[PDB]
Amino acid sequence: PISPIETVPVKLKPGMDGPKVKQWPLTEEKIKALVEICTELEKEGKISKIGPENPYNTPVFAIKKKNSTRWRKLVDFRELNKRTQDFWEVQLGIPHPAGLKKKKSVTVLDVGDAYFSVPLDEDFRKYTAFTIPSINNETPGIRYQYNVLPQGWKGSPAIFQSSMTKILEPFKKQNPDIVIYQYMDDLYVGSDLEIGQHRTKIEELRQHLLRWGLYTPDQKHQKEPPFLWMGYELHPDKWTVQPIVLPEKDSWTVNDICKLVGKLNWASQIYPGIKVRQLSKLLRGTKALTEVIPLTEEAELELAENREILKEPVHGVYYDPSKDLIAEIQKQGQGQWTYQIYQEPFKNLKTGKYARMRGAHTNDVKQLTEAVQKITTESIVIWGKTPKFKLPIQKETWETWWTEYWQATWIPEWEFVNTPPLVKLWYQLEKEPIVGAETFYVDGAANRETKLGKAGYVTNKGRQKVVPLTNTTNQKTELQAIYLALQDSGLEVNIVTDSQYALGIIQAQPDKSESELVNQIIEQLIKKEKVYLAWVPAHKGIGGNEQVDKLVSAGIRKVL
Amino acid sequence: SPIETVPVKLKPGMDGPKVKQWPLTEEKIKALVEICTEMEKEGKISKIGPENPYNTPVFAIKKKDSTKWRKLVDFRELNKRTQDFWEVQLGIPHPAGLKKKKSVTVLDVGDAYFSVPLDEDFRKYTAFTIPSINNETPGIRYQYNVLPQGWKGSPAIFQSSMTKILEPFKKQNPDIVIYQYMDDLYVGSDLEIGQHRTKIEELRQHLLRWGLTTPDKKHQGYELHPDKWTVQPIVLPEKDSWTVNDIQKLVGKLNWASQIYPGIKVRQLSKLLRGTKALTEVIPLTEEAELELAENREILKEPVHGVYYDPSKDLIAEIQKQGQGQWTYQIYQEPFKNLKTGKYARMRGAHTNDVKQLTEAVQKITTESIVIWGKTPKFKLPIQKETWETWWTEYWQATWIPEWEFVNTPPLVKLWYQGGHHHHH
DNA sequence: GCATGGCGCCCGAACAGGGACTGTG
DNA sequence: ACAGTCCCTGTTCGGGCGCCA
Numbered sequence A: 001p002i003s004p005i006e007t008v009p010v011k012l013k014p015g016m017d018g019p020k021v022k023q024w025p026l027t028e029e030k031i032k033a034l035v036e037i038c039t040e041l042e043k044e045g046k047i048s049k050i051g052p053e054n055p056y057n058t059p060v061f062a063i064k065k066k067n068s069t070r071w072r073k074l075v076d077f078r079e080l081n082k083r084t085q086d087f088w089e090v091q092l093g094i095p096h097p098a099g100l101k102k103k104k105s106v107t108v109l110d111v112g113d114a115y116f117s118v119p120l121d122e123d124f125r126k127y128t129a130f131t132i133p134s135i136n137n138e139t140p141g142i143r144y145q146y147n148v149l150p151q152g153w154k155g156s157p158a159i160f161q162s163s164m165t166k167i168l169e170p171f172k173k174q175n176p177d178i179v180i181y182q183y184m185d186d187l188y189v190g191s192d193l194e195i196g197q198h199r200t201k202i203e204e205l206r207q208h209l210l211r212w213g214l215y216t217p218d219q220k221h222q223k224e225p226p227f228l229w230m231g232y233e234l235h236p237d238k239w240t241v242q243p244i245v246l247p248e249k250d251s252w253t254v255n256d257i258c259k260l261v262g263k264l265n266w267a268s269q270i271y272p273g274i275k276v277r278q279l280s281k282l283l284r285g286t287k288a289l290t291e292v293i294p295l296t297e298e299a300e301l302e303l304a305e306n307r308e309i310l311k312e313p314v315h316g317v318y319y320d321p322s323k324d325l326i327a328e329i330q331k332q333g334q335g336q337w338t339y340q341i342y343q344e345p346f347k348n349l350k351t352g353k354y355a356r357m358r359g360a361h362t363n364d365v366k367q368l369t370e371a372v373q374k375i376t377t378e379s380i381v382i383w384g385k386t387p388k389f390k391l392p393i394q395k396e397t398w399e400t401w402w403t404e405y406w407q408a409t410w411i412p413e414w415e416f417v418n419t420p421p422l423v424k425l426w427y428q429l430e431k432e433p434i435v436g437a438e439t440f441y442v443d444g445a446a447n448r449e450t451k452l453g454k455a456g457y458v459t460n461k462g463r464q465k466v467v468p469l470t471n472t473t474n475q476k477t478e479l480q481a482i483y484l485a486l487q488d489s490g491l492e493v494n495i496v497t498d499s500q501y502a503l504g505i506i507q508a509q510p511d512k513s514e515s516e517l518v519n520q521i522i523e524q525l526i527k528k529e530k531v532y533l534a535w536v537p538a539h540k541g542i543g544g545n546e547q548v549d550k551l552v553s554a555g556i557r558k559v560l
Numbered sequence B: 001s002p003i004e005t006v007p008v009k010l011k012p013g014m015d016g017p018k019v020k021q022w023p024l025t026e027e028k029i030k031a032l033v034e035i036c037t038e039m040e041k042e043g044k045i046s047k048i049g050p051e052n053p054y055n056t057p058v059f060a061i062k063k064k065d066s067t068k069w070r071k072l073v074d075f076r077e078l079n080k081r082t083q084d085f086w087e088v089q090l091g092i093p094h095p096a097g098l099k100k101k102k103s104v105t106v107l108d109v110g111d112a113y114f115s116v117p118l119d120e121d122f123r124k125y126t127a128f129t130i131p132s133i134n135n136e137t138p139g140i141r142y143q144y145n146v147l148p149q150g151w152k153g154s155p156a157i158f159q160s161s162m163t164k165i166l167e168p169f170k171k172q173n174p175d176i177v178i179y180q181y182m183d184d185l186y187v188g189s190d191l192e193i194g195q196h197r198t199k200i201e202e203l204r205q206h207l208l209r210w211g212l213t214t215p216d217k218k219h220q221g222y223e224l225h226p227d228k229w230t231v232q233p234i235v236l237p238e239k240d241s242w243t244v245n246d247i248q249k250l251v252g253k254l255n256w257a258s259q260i261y262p263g264i265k266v267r268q269l270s271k272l273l274r275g276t277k278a279l280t281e282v283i284p285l286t287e288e289a290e291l292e293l294a295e296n297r298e299i300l301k302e303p304v305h306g307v308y309y310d311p312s313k314d315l316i317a318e319i320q321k322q323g324q325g326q327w328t329y330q331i332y333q334e335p336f337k338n339l340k341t342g343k344y345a346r347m348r349g350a351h352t353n354d355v356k357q358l359t360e361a362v363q364k365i366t367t368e369s370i371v372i373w374g375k376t377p378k379f380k381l382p383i384q385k386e387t388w389e390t391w392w393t394e395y396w397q398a399t400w401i402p403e404w405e406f407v408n409t410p411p412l413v414k415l416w417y418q419g420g421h422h423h424h425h
Numbered sequence C: 001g002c003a004t005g006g007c008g009c010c011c012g013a014a015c016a017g018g019g020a021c022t023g024t025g
Numbered sequence D: 001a002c003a004g005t006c007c008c009t010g011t012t013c014g015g016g017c018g019c020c021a
């Protein structure tokens, strides 16, 4: 039976007409499937045969189902969708087991031919016209036109979900105490009644739907502890991902690496420490899904260590609102971070990782801060609150930071945990000049046409140096200078410069970078004991600044 | 007895807003769902489907002295697309008055707007979607059927009414100036605080007789005083002795300053660093040097020339983190042509949470702008997009929301806007 | 020669903005 | 004294994959 629920009004974008794309070559064998199906949807009144006047059409096709025991008709309304009004999607996120609370009784149902049970706006039906070929392709098959939500349309998912919510509204009102998670047509109903009483409600519901056209086949979990839901196994007290099967092969293609990392990342949900960093580098730069990329050293190793983790399966524990949450993070590797949120020490509620490296030059504090924020958000989405943080960073370290960094910054309630490695700033620039230390005035310059460059320094103790540079940028030189000044520097040095660019990078105390040079500058700074970089308006004839310039900009701005 | 509506012609080639909803907290949602059930009951809003292609985010807030949650829509983007409507067809005029008054109070009169019905056509654009915790269910969508709290177009419509409601009050009190900017009413007078508050209490009353509600507080000063507002500019440090480092830095500021005021001269001071010396090395300021310095120090007193406000341009606000819980900001329309410049101190009855402070600071700057130009500035916030987008709502306390923008640019100019002048005692 | 919506991750291209040279006036 | 250009960095948006339906 179709549904008695009001259809949602849909329209095509202004000035545009229906689709008139022809039916493409189909498997004679496959065709069978569709012809079978269309004969059913016909008597069921879900679709309708149509006359000659209808000029629209859209290629259709089948695809194996979950158990490959049947087939799901799909339509290629790709051309229709572009000519169709926009919809605001009502699906905001995805449920998560770790956000689920315990309930004495539970059940989960699904809707047989779900889309196919929600009436499709009448006047829009015209365009949903398609054509089924004859078993032998002698003469035109039967032209059909959907009367219900057709798979492969912008509107179907959102229409249904919205209409499926309207259906559950009454029922929800009457039984405030029942919990119903609805993802599409997938229903998870959990309560604190007794097994039998439960079944009752479930009968109401299952029937309630039936009055609305939402048929409910007996392929819905009833009295089973292992509940198959949203890709997980839901147990009375615990849960976990469903069997996760990493691919096993000698050589790999680009696409193969994707399928891999995507699998591994989906496992990061609960399997702590999973890393895909290196594996991901393999797909750097334009490539092609087919191209056969080779697993480097790391990757081979990573995939391995990462493979030894999926050995001993893990489980997650459900959510208890009766006690605040805890999220702990640790520094995985350079750039990489992993975390886990729990309520009881060993019982991890859920795990994850944060590797995204944002920026050219940063450090650990800032990245650490990023994860905090990343988790905070993710936590509000699942539980609605922000958890307490256990961070491997000195309370003193951080205070220094936020009280010295020029940008506003903050971390919620958090406590220090001495679980190595530990985050810390690797050096600090002196606030005031150091007495009795070589004062390096540094600069550099370059020709934006020859790309040649001189980066030089000159000190008060009369020492001096300039180096020539093949193809550089007016910026890099200024950088080089400071490098030179730091190399040839002592253990306590003063460095004045006119380069904000340079000065800028250094002042944020970086401990990582994509810039070769900077890492060198970095390294050199750690080794130092008391550094102090100063700034001075370029071309203003100040102290030694004036001189270095004269030097470094020797043969790049003389004459034209 | 029917009740009319004003059609809201949207600007040509203007598409409505389509903003995704940002995840709210346990309480925020709870409270928001409740606020929405009633509003839907009182017919303020109605449930919509996905056939409507528009959206705007919403959230909730709990104000000072208040323990009731207030719905808050971010029509910021709708406001932008509906500007010609409220800035041209029907625009609330800004009186230069309260800028001058000795005391201004702000009333949340906004609730009035629910009283008038919103045009049917423009309604599609007021859509909003309430999220659900851990995504139990697909977001519920609603749209307003009455002027909504937060759209600049609402105060534009009610203008007709509000004025009438006030003609009496404005008659008996010919000195009090009242400005209506969005959901608020700025009431300013020269009276004494005690009498002022009273006149306010009378205004609240006056409003009640005309059915308008003004949320009341749990009552545990508050009101703004456009007098203690002082534009304070740059100050060259003054010390007994001087080192190269010092003179350099000084030339720093001065040089940067020469951008604001063109009078600054650096010539003589530059001479002091004539030649490559050590930093800690001490230097005595010469006769011509000392003059120039003081000569300059004088210039920094008279504000620039050409700082004339111009309604046809946007208003830009910049905040500098000075630390120690101290903050500084400048508001301008064209670079180096500051229209104002102040600071921001510590929290009373609260803590030192870096972010929260900016949040408070930003709001501070905004009202001052409202009071002074009856426009909101575009803020250049000194904090990472995420850090901010993570907690600004958690500390926000105003019905309006400014148009912010993020930026990072350290004190390369070495503390160009803070305390420097401190000689020996 | 094979579709839709939603979220996640990773990658890189496209576009934006801001300081600093450069040339012409 | 003001565009025109270059370097560098940050943000958004699109493609692929994973997972759900």
Ligand SMILES: Cc1cn([C@H]2C[C@H](N=[N+]=[N-])[C@@H](COP(=O)(O)OP(=O)(O)OP(=O)(O)OP(=O)(O)OC[C@H]3O[C@@H](n4cnc5c(N)ncnc54)[C@H](O)[C@@H]3O)O2)c(=O)[nH]c1=O
Pocket (backbone or CB within 6 Å): A001, A065, A070, A072, A110, A111, A112, A113, A114, A115, A116, A117, A151, A152, A184, A185, A215, A217, A218, A219, D021
């Ligand atoms: C995965 C996927 C989903 N979807 C959209 C469209 C689809 N809605 N519909 N129709 C909705 C729900 O997905 P679901 O995975 O539940 O598929 P659907 O609801 O289409 O069929 P379902 O999977 O529920 O059906 P089965 O699990 O294969 O079989 C259930 C059994 O019940 C009996 N049964 C079902 N209907 C009837 C009936 N009318 N009369 C008698 N017996 C019936 C029958 O014996 C069958 O074996 O998501 C999509 O567009 N593409 C996809 O790739």
Ligand SMILES: [Mg+2]
Pocket (backbone or CB within 6 Å): A110, A111, A112, A113, A114, A185
């Ligand atoms: Mg189904």
Ligand SMILES: [Mg+2]
Pocket (backbone or CB within 6 Å): A443, A444, A445, A478, A498, A499, A538
């Ligand atoms: Mg230079």
